């Protein structure tokens, strides 16, 4: 994969995360009902955000990459991204994909997050 | 009495003041998370105030979120969502991460007002 090719990718995770919610969140009175597809849309559109932070960083050597990997990497180049990053781990990573809770408003601010980090890597390229 | 419902709005308020004065707000994110966790413990807080007035005691042991969610959901199903938000965004991620994307906080407490403004109503029905 190349510079714009990671970044298509990325964006399709979030475009399939809120196809998800769009088609099996059950959105009633502001909030999706069918916890799981919450979980699968959260985690699909954090996926979506890795991809993307994998492929503009690094490959790093010795053991797995956590929050902290990603976490020290944002910090020396836009604290703003680093932030709006830790929103969406806290947003999609722990309140959707691990909880399972959807309210509307707070994931359509959550993804939009996301997507300032994707065009944000783009832009950076 | 039943100015247990302005006294939670004292705490919603006061968390929105300490958010103010000293969250250090930055880029649209609150930089001191030492007064975001606070913040969100008080706002939180006062939710948790006015539905111990209106729920009244728990025979047994401490209350916790189980508790407050299954007399919520005898209740209504919306309330019970909007108040599991409310747990998500102002008792996990900023009362205890510490994670305070004012943006999303507004909308947490907007929640959290729209459970007190639901106790008031009740309690004078």
């Given at each position: 994969l190349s510079a714009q090719e990671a970044v298509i990718e990325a964006k399709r995770y979030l475009n399939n995360a809120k196809d998800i919610l769009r088609d099996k969140?059950?959105?009633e009175d502001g909030f999706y009902q069918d916890s799981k597809y919450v979980k699968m849309a959260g985690h699909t559109a954090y996926s979506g955000v890795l991809f993307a932070l994998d492929h503009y960083f690094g490959k790093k050597t010795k053991g797995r990459k956590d929050v902290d990997w990603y976490k020290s990497n944002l910090a020396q180049q836009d604290k703003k991204i680093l932030n709006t990053f830790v929103s969406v781990y806290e947003q999609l990573?722990?309140?959707?994909?691990?909880?399972?809770?959807?309210d509307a408003e707070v994931v359509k601010l959550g993804f939009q997050r996301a997507e300032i980090i994707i065009d944000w890597v783009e832009r950076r390229l």
């Open positions: 969140g059950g959105k990573h722990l309140v959707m994909a691990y909880d399972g809770v959807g």
